[PDB]
Amino acid sequence: ELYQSLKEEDRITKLDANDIIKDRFLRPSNALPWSLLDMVQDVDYKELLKVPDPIN
């Protein structure tokens, strides 16, 4: 909608509350932070060897 407007000297541009508080302090999220994750998360010797290679 703005690029359509763009389709039609260092000039200077002519471009000049409760929502911010609600979004910054009282908006719950479905992505759990690391604090809740810390609150809820719970955390053969022959396979270390090398078998020798074939011989031709």
Partner: protein, 358 residues
């Protein structure tokens, strides 16, 4: 691929930021935000000022940020550029002054789209690719003759996998297209079929939305793909293998990151053995593809300009330009300008050329 020597220089080349650069055998072309298109002759002499051999043309009042050049043997030389308003503009270069001929190659319904990126695909018919602000890629075939009578034929479009901003595009010599998006996703599709092949996401984490693809490049052999992307105020490079679509590794240096601020552009040399990246921190770094290890580093200063009157130490606001960020970088084939060459454009409105020792 270890020693680079400065060759020629030009300060205060444009009146605004130089956003892109491209080169061919005959000349080097650059664009800027003032709206002009400049041509720099590659075949120079000793102790000749590059501003003496330069030709400028006014294109758009809004400014330009992308450019590409096509040269093929009747000799045709085409330039395509994108403006800040969103237009796609084609010009024909003819020579010993330089003549700019505006070409009207797009129909009326194709002039309502806002384009961002573009790239030429040379014959090995020539092809043109472009990205849209809506997340679409367009494929064209260029026919010069029917006698000179150029036409652009639309082949098809590729939609976005998810829509997001399409920021970068590339085309390989084996017939592949890579598109980068602003969330860190890269899509690879087939040229002859217009069907997507691979779709891999390169994000370190999704906690914050500061991931974005800035550049995608294909290896000269076409079997490798390099990706430059953001990581919340850092710059990262990841290498992928295009035949089967698997992650190879990453390029990093102590400063898990390739650059300190942001990686703007990438470039391969002729053999595809060395990769160069340009950073917002004001550095050029060169990497070995096989060993994934850094080779060399170049530093950019405002005092590199040969003529002392063209040195721009500060901008219009007083901020220092002692170590300016690099916008774009390009490798030049042997014989264009003995050995390979390199060009880059910076924040101090300068364009610089380098030579490889050997």
């Amino acid at each position: 691929s270890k020693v680079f020597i400065a060759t020629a220089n030009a300060g205060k080349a444009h009146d605004a930021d130089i956003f892109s650069v491209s080169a061919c055998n005959s000349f080097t072309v650059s664009c800027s935000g003032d709206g002009y298109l400049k041509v720099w002759d590659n075949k120079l002499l000793d102790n000749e000022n590059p501003k003496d051999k330069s030709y400028s043309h006014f294109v758009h009042k809004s400014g330009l940020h992308h450019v590409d050049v096509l040269q093929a043997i009747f000799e045709l030389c085409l330039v395509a550029t994108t403006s800040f308003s969103g237009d796609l503009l084609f010009y024909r270069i003819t020579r010993k002054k330089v003549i700019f001929e505006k070409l009207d190659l797009l129909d009326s319904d194709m002039k309502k789209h806002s384009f961002w990126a573009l790239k030429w695909g040379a014959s090995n018919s020539h092809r043109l690719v472009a990205t849209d602000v809506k997340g679409t890629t367009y494929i064209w075939k260029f026919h010069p003759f029917a006698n000179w009578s150029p036409t652009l034929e639309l082949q098809g479009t590729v939609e976005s996998p998810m829509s997001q901003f399409a920021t970068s595009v590339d085309i390989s010599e084996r017939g592949l297209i890579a598109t980068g998006f602003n969330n860190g996703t890269v899509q690879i599709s087939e040229l002859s079929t217009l069907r997507p092949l691979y779709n891999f996401e390169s994000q370190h984490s999704m906690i914050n939305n500061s991931n974005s693809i800035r550049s995608v490049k294909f290896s000269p052999q076409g079997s490798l793909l390099a990706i430059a992307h953001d990581s919340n105020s850092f710059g990262c490079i990841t290498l992928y293998e295009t035949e089967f679509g698997e992650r190879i590794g990453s390029l990093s240096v102590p400063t898990e990151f390739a650059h300190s601020s942001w990686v703007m552009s990438l470039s391969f040399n002729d053999s595809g053995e060395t990769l160069c990246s340009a950073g917002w921190d004001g550095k050029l770094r060169f990497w070995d593809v096989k060993t994934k290890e850094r080779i060399t580093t170049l530093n950019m200063h405002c005092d590199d300009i040969e003529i002392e009157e063209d040195i721009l130490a500060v901008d219009e606001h007083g901020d220092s330009l002692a170590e300016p960020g690099v916008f774009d970088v390009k490798f030049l084939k042997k014989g264009w300008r003995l050995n390979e060459s390199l060009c880059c454009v910076c924040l101090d409105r300068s364009i610089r050329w380098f030579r490889e020792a050997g």
